[PDB]
Amino acid sequence: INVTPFIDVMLVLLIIFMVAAPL
Amino acid sequence: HEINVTPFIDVMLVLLIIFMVAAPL
Amino acid sequence: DLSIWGMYQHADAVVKAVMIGLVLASIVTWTILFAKGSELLRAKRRLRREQLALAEARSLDEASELAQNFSPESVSAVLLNDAQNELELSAESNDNNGIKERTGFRLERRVAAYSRNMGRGNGFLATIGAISPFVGLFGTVWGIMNSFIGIAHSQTTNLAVVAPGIAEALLATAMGLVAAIPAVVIYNIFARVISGHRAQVGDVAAQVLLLQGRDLDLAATAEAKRSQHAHQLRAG
Amino acid sequence: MYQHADAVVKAVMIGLVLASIVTWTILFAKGSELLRAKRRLRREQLALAEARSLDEASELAQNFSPESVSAVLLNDAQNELELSAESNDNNGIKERTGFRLERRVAAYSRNMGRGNGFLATIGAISPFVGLFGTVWGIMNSFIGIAHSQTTNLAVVAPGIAEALLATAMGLVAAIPAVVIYNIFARVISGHRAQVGDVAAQVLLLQGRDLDLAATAEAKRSQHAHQLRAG
Amino acid sequence: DLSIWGMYQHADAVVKAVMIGLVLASIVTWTILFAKGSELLRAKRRLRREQLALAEARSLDEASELAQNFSPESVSAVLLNDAQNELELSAESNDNNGIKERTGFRLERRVAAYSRNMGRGNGFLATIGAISPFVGLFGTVWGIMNSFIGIAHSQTTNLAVVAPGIAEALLATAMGLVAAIPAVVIYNIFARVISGHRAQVGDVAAQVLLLQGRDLDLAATAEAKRSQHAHQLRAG
Amino acid sequence: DLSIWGMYQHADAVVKAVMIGLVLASIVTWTILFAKGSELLRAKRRLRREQLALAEARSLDEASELAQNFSPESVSAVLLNDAQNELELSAESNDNNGIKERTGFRLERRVAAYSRNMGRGNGFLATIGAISPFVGLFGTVWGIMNSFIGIAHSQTTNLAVVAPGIAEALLATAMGLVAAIPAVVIYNIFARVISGHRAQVGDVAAQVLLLQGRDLDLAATAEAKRSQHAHQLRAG
Amino acid sequence: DLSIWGMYQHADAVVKAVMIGLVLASIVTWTILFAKGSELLRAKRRLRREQLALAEARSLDEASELAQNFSPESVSAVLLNDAQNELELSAESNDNNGIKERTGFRLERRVAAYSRNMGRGNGFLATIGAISPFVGLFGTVWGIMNSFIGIAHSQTTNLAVVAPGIAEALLATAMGLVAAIPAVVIYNIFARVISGHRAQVGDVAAQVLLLQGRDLDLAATAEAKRSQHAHQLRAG
C-alpha cells in the first residue's frame, strides 16, 4: 500500500555512511 | 490499477549495504 | 536532550512546522477516534435496544404506537414518520406500487444521509493516514537539504556534526509514521463498524417497508376483491 | 554528464511547479463554484420543500437563477410530459422521466469531477520522476568519481543535492495533490448526494401529482360508464 | 547473539514491546486462520450436502422435510422457514407479484446478513497485514534514530558500532513482514471462499424463489381459468 | 557455487527453502498459464463456432435442432436445455412474465458460476503476483540479518568475509523478483483474456435469453389474442 | 564503461535485452497513444455532430432518416440499426414493455462490447507500464549480482570499477521508470476519455430508448383504446 517510504531514508543512510567512510 | 511499490527498496537496500561495506573505515 | 519529546526546544524553520503539523494530526485523530467511538457505541446500543423493541411489529399503526415512546433522535421513528407522511401525501391515490417505490427511494435517501453523517470524518482519517508518512518524508528531505547546504558551506570531516540533523530528520519521519498507523487502523475499524451499522439500518428499513407493503396489500386485496367481484359484474 | 544532465532536471522541476500551481488554481476555482452551487441548491431545496404540486414548484423555480440543475430537470420533466402528449401510459412516462433524470445527474456529476484524475496522476507520478532525477544524478556522480578515483566525496554533494531537491518538489506537489484530490472526492460525493435528493424529490412530486390526477379520473370515468355500458 | 531468539535485550524497551506485539498478532492471526478455516470447510460440506439433497426439490413441504432431517443449524433451513412463514403471514392475499418482490427482498437481506456474519475476521486480517509493514518500518526508524543519537552522545569511528541497532531494525522488519504476508494470503483466500459460498447460497435462494413461483403459478392459473372466468363473467 | 546450479550447495536452511518456494511458484504459474489459457482459447474457438451457428437461429425449436449436435461440453447447449427444462417445469401456466423472470435468474446464476469456474485460478495468480515481492523482501531482511550477524560476531573491518553472504542475499532478492515478474505479467494478460471470454459468454447468454423471450412472446401473442378476445369478449 | 553509451553493444546481453524490451514498450505505447487518440478524437467529433443533428428527434423513422447521411464508420448508426432490426424482429406482437426491455438489454450489451473493443489498448499500456519497472529491476539486480561475483573472483575493495557497473544498472532502472511513467499516465488519460465516450454512448442509448418508448406509447394508447372500446363494447 504505502511501503514506498524506504527510498529516501535508505538513500540518505547511504549518503551519510559514504561521507563518514573517510572519517 | 497501480504499477508497484516494492521493487525499488531492494536496490536501495543493496546499494546501502555495498556502500557501507566498501566504506574503508 | 534529543528525545522523542525534546523537539520544540531544538526545532528549526521547517522542523517546527512539520512538528506542529504532526502533533496536530495526532491530536485530531485521537479526539476523532474517541468522540466518534463513544458516540457511535452509545448510538448503536440505543439502536439495538430500539430494534429489539420493534422486532415484533404487526401493523403500521401498531408500530407507530409502540415507537411513539422512543427517543427523539430515533432513526426508526424517523422512517415511520416518513412512511406516514408519505401515505398522507398519497391520500386518495390508488397506486400501491407507486407508493412503494416512493417509500423505497425515501428510505434509501435517509440511509444515505445517515451514512454521510456517520461517514463524515472517515474521509479526513484516510487523508491523514495517507499524507502523514509523506509529510514526514518531506520534512526528512528538507532536513537532508539543510544538512547538505551546511556541509557544502562548511566542509569539515567531523563525524559528530552529521548526527543531529539526520537524527531529527528520522525523528520527524517516525512522528509521521506514528501519526499514520493509528489513523489508518481507526479508519479501518470505523469502516467495519459503519458497515455493521448500515446493515442494521438497512435491515430495519426493510422491516418497516415490508410491514407497510404487507398491511396495505392485505387491505387492498380484501376490499378490492370483495367489492369488485361482488358488485361490478352484476351491475353491468 | 555531457552537459545534458540537469536540463531534464530543471524540466521536471518546472513541470512539478506548474502542476502544483495548476492544482492550486483549480482548487480555488472549483471550491468557489462548488460552494456557490451548494449554497444555491440548499436555498432552493429549502424553498421547494414546501411544494405540493408541480405548478407551485415550477412557478417558484422560474424565479430562481436558471443556472441550476434543479429547474433544468423540472422543465425537462414538464417537456417530457408535454411530449407524452395525451398518452395514458403513466407508468412508462414515469420510467422514462426517471431514466432521463438519472442520465442527466450522472452527466452533471461527471462534468463536476474535472481535475480528479488530473491530481491523481500528478501525485502518482511526481515521486517517480523524483526517483528518476535521483538515479540520474547519482549515476553522473558515479561517472565523475570514477573519472577521478578518490575516497573524498566532496563532489557528489551538488548532484545528490539537486536530486533530493527534485524529490522534495515531487513530494510538495504530490501531498497537496492527493489531499485536495480526496477533498474534491468528498465534496463531489456530497453534491452528488444532494442532486440525487432533489431528483428523487422532483420525481416523487411528478408521480404524486400524476397519481392524484389519475385516481379520481379513473375511478369515476372508465369504471361506471363502461361497466354499465358493457 | 546466537540468533534472533537471543537478541531481546540490546534493543529499546518499546522495540521489544512492539516485537511481542507482532508475535502475538501473528499467533492470533494463525488462530483465526485455523478456526475460520475449520468453520468454512464445515459450512462448505454442509452446503454441498444440502444442495445434493435439494437436487430434486420440487415441493415446498418436500424441501423443508428433506432439509430438516440434516443439521437444522443451517442457513438453508433458515431460508426455508423464512419463506414458509412469510407465505403464511401474507396468506389469503392476491399480491402474487408483490409476494415475490417482498419475499426476494427479505431473502436477499438475510443472505447479506449471513454473508456479513461469515466474513468477519477478514477485515481484522486486512488491517493486521496493512499495519504490520508500517509498524515494522516505525520500529526500524526508531531503532536507527536511537543508534544515531547514541553515536552522537558518544564518539565512535569504527564500522561495527552500528551493528546492534540496525540488526534489531532488520529483525523488526522481518517480524512485520512475516505477519503481513500470511495476512493478505488468507485475506484473499477467504475472499474467494466467501465469494463461492455467496454464489452457492444465492443459488439455493433462487431455487427456493423458483419453487415458490412455480407453486403459486400452479395454484393461481388453474383456479383462475376454471373459476375466475366462470364466476361472474357468465352473469354479466 | 555462486549461480543457481551451485548456490543451493552452500544454501542455508531458509535460503534453499525460499528458493524452492519461488521456483515452485514460477513453475506452478507457468503450468497454470499454459493449461488454463489453452483450455480457455479452445473453449473460445468452440463458443465462436457456436455463436456463428446461432447467428442464423431465429426461433426456439430451430435453435434446439441446431444444438442437437453441438460439442460434448457446449455451454450454449447447457443454456438451451436449462430454458427447455424450465419451460417444462413452469408449463401449464399463463403467467409467462414470472417464467421469464425465473429464467433470467437461473441464467444469471449459471453464467456467474461458469465465470467463476472458468477464471478459477485468476485469484491464485493475483495472490502470487502480490506476495512474491513480499517473500522477496523476506529474503532481503533474512540475508541482511545474517550478514550483520557475521559482521557483528566477527568485529573485524574485513570485506571479503561478508561479500559472498550479501551476494547470495541479493541473489535471493533477484530470484524472488524474476519469479514475481512472470507471475504478475501472466496474471494481467490472463485477466484480460478471461474478461474477454466472460464478455463473450455474456453475449451468448443475452442471445439465448433474447431468443427465449422472443419465442415465448411469439407463441403466446396471437393465440392468446384470438382465443381470449373471441371467447371472453363475445360471451360476456 | 566511462562513456554512458560506450557499453551497450558489449558486456551486456540480458541488460541489452531488457533495454530493447523497454524501448520497444515505450515506442509501442507511443504509437498506441497516437492511433487511439486519433480514433477517439474522430469518434467524439462524429458523436457530437450526430447528437446535435438528432437532438430534434420525434420518432424512430425520422431518426433513421437523419442518420442515413452519417458516415459508415458511425457507432451510433450501428446502434440505431440494431434497434431497428430488433424492432423488426419483435414486430407482429403486443409485448410493449417486453420489446422495449429486450432492446434495452441488447443495447446495453452492444455498448459494453463497443466500449471494451474501443478501449482495448488501456490494459495494454497498463500492463506495459507495470512490467517495465519489473524488467528494469531484474536487469539492475542481475548487473549487481554480476558485479558481486566479479568482486568475489578478484577481491577488489576499491571504488573505481564499482562505479560503471552500478551506473549501467541504475541506467536500466531509470529507463524502465521513464518507460513506465508515460505508460501509466497515458493509460489514465485513455481510461478517463473512454469513460466519457462510453457515457456519451449511454446518453445516445437512453435517447433512442426513450424515443422508442414514447413512439410506441403514442402509437398504441389512443388508437388501441378508442378502436377496441368502440368495437367490443358495441359488439359485446
Author numbering:
A (entry chain F): 18 to 40
B (entry chain G): 16 to 40
C (entry chain E), E (entry chain D), F (entry chain C), G (entry chain B): 46 to 281
D (entry chain A): 52 to 281
The authors write:
Due to this strong bias in particle orientation, the resolution achieved was 3.96 Å, precluding reliable positioning of the side chains. As observed for ExbBSm alone, in the ExbBDSm complex, ExbBSm behaves as a pentamer, and no sign of other assemblies was found. Similarly, no density could be attributed to the periplasmic extension. Two clear densities inside the ExbBSm pore were assigned to the pair of ExbDSm TM segments. In the refined model, Asp 25 from ExbDSm monomer chain G faces Thr 218 from ExbBSm chain C, while Asp 25 from the ExbDSm chain F faces the interface between two ExbBSm monomers A and E. As compared to the structure of ExbBSm, there is a slight «opening» towards the periplasmic side (the distance of Ala 197 from one subunit to Leu 204 of the facing subunit varying from 25.5 Å in ExbBSm to 29.8 Å in ExbBDSm, much greater than any error expected due to the difference in resolution of the two structures). This opening of the structure is limited to the periplasmic part. In summary, we show that ExbBD from S. marcescens has a 5:2 stoichiometry with a larger channel allowing solvent or proton transport from the periplasmic side as compared with the E. coli structure.
ExbB and ExbD are cytoplasmic membrane proteins that associate with TonB to convey the energy of the proton-motive force to outer membrane receptors in Gram-negative bacteria for iron uptake. The opportunistic pathogen Serratia marcescens (Sm) possesses both TonB and a heme-specific TonB paralog, HasB. ExbBSm has a long periplasmic extension absent in other bacteria such as E. coli (Ec). We purified ExbBSm alone and ExbBDSm and determined their structures by single-particle cryo-EM at 3.1 and 3.96 Å resolution, respectively.
